[PDB]
Nucleic acid binder design. Structure first.
Ligand SMILES: [Zn+2]
Length: 96
DNA sequence: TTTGTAGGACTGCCCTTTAAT
DNA sequence: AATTAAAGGGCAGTCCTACAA
């Protein structure tokens, strides 16, 4: 049997693995909901990590891995970090 | 039988902006 | 002006499941 893309697939295969739509309603887990257990599991394994979208910062010399560390260190809200980094009154900038 | 797959369904952690003080 | 709690918007890592192999 031949697949819509042209390659030969098993008579039972609805499409080659390469043509298989897995987006939206086509995903095998589409419209499903996760249990409180699964949620809890995921939760535990994500604890301790840092997202890829952090920004190294330098507080007039003292550098941190992310704004949150800068905030937790100075003991301020994360929004105030943003404020200062933009204020001309502070020497706070995000590192390359 | 078993395995691989990819995106849906989620998470922690993150950054910014807004309201309200 | 200075500050913060929430709401807005993000990202890769985890789980989960039907289907090709
Ligand atoms: Zn195909």
């Amino acid at each position: 049997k031949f697949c819509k893309c042209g390659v030969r697939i098993q008579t039972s295969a609805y499409t080659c693995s390469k043509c298989r739509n897995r987006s939206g309603e086509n995903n095998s887990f589409f419209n499903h909901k996760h249990s409180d257990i699964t949620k809890s599991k995921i939760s535990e394994k994500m604890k301790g990590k840092k997202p890829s979208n952090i920004k190294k910062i330098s507080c007039d010399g003292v550098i941190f891995d992310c704004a949150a560390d800068a905030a937790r260190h100075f003991k301020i809200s994360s929004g105030l970090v943003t404020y200062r980094v933009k204020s001309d009154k502070w020497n706070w900038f995000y590192i390359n």
